[PDB]
Symmetry: C2
Subunit: 112 residues, 2 copies
């Protein structure tokens, strides 16, 4: 979990409501192959708001690659423990994947 | 592919650049179990823009369920054939999942 960056303190919503989905998200979306600069996401509804998860290949080029499931879990647990309004990070600075855990206003039926 | 509705929204990105990801999206995201009103998505970069895909459990309740992989492919291929700017729909009016294919401005690095 380096870098690990918290979202700003102006958010309404607390990451504690989202941490229960970390295993489900990491288990289901990290085995996929992601081209450079592509992402995969899930949205989960909770009481009063939603939880948005992201896995993102930060590489600019190179081969499409799958992500590490245990690194996803390590990073997102660190964000849930250190960042009350959610956060994002990598397992170490040379790693290609970024993982994010983001509590947000609204629901999962919007933007499509 | 009923209901099947085209996007009609001032965007001028052609769905034809996104159709190449239909199989990859459906194959990777439909085997996941989704709670009622939850979604999964993927974003793919293409020349000049991006392609946003969604699978969404429209049920209000019931137990979490997975989606049909061939139904996902039928609905998205219908939208790609009938909707030049993308679209969204269900396999028939009683089915729980909605699938969407959305050629959009931008990249896959925004809002996380
Ligand atoms: Cl709705
Ligand atoms: Cl049709
Ligand atoms: Cl329509
Ligand atoms: Cl409609
Ligand atoms: Cl509608
Ligand atoms: Cl809907
Ligand atoms: Cl509704
Ligand atoms: Cl058709
Ligand atoms: Cl027809
Ligand atoms: Cl037709
Ligand atoms: Cl709709
Ligand atoms: Cl529709
Ligand atoms: Pt509709
Ligand atoms: Pt149409
Ligand atoms: Pt709805
Ligand atoms: Pt048709």
């Amino acid at each position: 979990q380096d870098p690990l960056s918290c979202y700003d303190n102006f958010g309404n919503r607390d990451v504690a409501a989202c941490a229960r989905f970390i295993d489900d998200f990491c288990d289901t979306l990290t085995p996929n192959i992601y081209r450079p600069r592509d992402n995969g996401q899930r949205c989960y509804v909770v009481n009063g708001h939603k939880c948005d998860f992201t896995v993102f290949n930060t590489n600019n080029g190179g081969s499409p690659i799958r992500a590490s499931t245990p690194n996803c879990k390590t990073v997102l647990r660190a964000a849930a423990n250190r960042c009350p309004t959610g956060g994002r990070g990598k397992i170490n600075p040379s790693a290609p994947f970024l993982f994010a855990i983001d509590p947000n206003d609204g629901d999962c039926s919007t933007d499509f």
